[PDB]
């Protein structure tokens, strides 16, 4: 299935190095480098600008509403400050939204306007974006929160949202520590972190290690393992694996995690799921995160081979041998590399 191109080489022996763990014996070609697949981006050019969610919150009775659309006021309605018990409808969420949204339609149809139990959504104008979105209704904007796609914290994210959306919560631009992308899924009221704008989620696959597996029918299938999609926001925050430029030099099952010894990096896949190499989640450390580490030492050292052993993998490199040891749960937190011997090795 999926070809047999990866196996081929002029000298099969030197190049094809492999490991075996029952169901799937992983065959990894030293020779062929990986490539990021840029023809399959998830978000092509998410138009951050086009859509704004007019939050639907409490009216506060008399405080009138002015909501600029694209920086131009078209949304003006003042709540009927009428005592009548019937008049009290003047402030409920759905009705207030209707008042405001039909009014948006009147000014221009380029942007389509909608009503949701919790929101009013502007469909992107076909060519013209919201140049600027702002609103000052009521004294503290306690009726409508413009939410945009960028906001300050976990807070200030609207409670109900369309079946797909994107919100990037950023602490400040220079420090990217808290940046992560959140999407709202409608069926279950939940908000999840899915990859963000414009970053492809997968390596070319073919170029990555292929796997030899045995079918239930007693014949065997060469196959491309379905390496995991990153599923986290932004290229920088979820670092690309970084073995992509390099050949995958040897493959090793240290601990329980799968692992690739790359050009200078021990890229160890998330420890308990064999194929989810990219960081599992952006803003909360999970010890089941993969460990991507490079042995800098004081001399750039290619890592030639690796030997699994038991408690601690040993990494052998051309000019030194280093042991990565962690008795506690192997995690990014406890790696503890040691350089302890200095004998030489050859190819």
């Amino acid at each position: 299935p999926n070809g047999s191109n990866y196996i081929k080489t002029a000298n099969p022996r030197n190049d094809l190095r492999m490991v075996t763990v029952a169901d799937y014996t992983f065959i990894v070609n030293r020779n062929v480098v990986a490539q990021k697949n840029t023809k399959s981006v998830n978000l092509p050019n998410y138009n951050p600008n086009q859509d704004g969610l007019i939050n639907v919150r409490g009216g506060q009775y008399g405080r009138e509403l002015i909501v600029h659309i694209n920086g131009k006021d078209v949304a003006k309605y003042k709540i009927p400050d009428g005592s009548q018990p019937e008049h009290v409808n003047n402030t409920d969420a759905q009705w207030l939204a209707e008042e405001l949204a039909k009014q948006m339609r009147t000014n221009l149809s380029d942007w389509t306007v909608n009503v949701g139990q919790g929101f009013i959504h502007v469909t992107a104008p076909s060519g013209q974006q919201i140049d600027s979105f702002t609103t000052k209704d009521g004294y503290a904007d306690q009726l409508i929160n413009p939410v945009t796609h960028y906001a300050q914290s976990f807070s200030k994210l609207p409670p109900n949202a369309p079946n797909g959306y994107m919100v990037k919560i950023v602490g400040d631009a220079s420090k990217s520590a808290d940046q992560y992308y959140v999407r709202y899924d409608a069926e279950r009221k939940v908000w999840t972190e899915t990859l963000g704008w414009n970053t492809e989620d997968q390596v070319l696959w073919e170029t990555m290690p292929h796997a030899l597996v045995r079918a239930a029918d007693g014949n065997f299938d060469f196959k491309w393992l379905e390496w995991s999609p990153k599923s986290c926001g932004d290229v920088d925050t979820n670092p690309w694996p970084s073995f992509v430029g390099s050949s995958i030099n040897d493959v090793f099952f240290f601990r329980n995690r799968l692992g690739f010894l790359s050009g200078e990096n021990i890229i160890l896949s998330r420890t308990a799921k064999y194929f989810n190499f990219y960081p599992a989640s952006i803003a909360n450390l999970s010890d089941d995160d993969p460990i991507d580490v490079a042995v800098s030492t004081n001399r750039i050292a290619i890592l030639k081979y690796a030997v699994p052993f038991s408690e601690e993998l040993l990494i052998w490199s051309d000019e030194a041998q280093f042991v990565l040891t962690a008795s506690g749960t192997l995690t990014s937190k406890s790696v503890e590399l040691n350089l302890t011997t200095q004998f030489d090795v050859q190819d």
Binding site: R57, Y61, S83, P85, H87, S286, D287, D288
Partner: protein, 102 residues
């Protein structure tokens, strides 16, 4: 009577704003318990992946702690719903007394 209707309706809108605040801080509580849950279940996966136990009973212990956190979330959302019942019924009773005086 007009002043009375307006005052009671302003109090009701204040209570609704209060409800909105309650829901969003409940969301901030749920998401914080989530931010704890991710670290916990990550630690659990680390443990199971490293001991070669490979067992349904381990799977059982993972499901046990997951159910722990799920019950906790259900507890906090039940707290929210009780508070909503309280504030709604309160504004209803107030409107009723005002209507009787009217």
């Amino acid at each position: 009577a007009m002043e009375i209707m307006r005052q009671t309706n302003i109090q009701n809108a204040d209570l609704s704003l209060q409800a909105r605040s309650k829901l969003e801080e409940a969301s901030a509580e749920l998401t914080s318990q989530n931010m704890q849950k991710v670290q916990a279940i990550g630690s659990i996966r680390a443990a199971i992946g490293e001991s070669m136990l490979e067992g349904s009973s381990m799977d059982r212990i993972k499901r046990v702690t997951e159910g722990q956190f799920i019950r906790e979330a259900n507890m906090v959302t039940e707290n929210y719903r009780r508070d909503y019942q309280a504030i709604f019924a309160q504004q209803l009773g107030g409107t009723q007394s005002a209507a009787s005086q009217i």
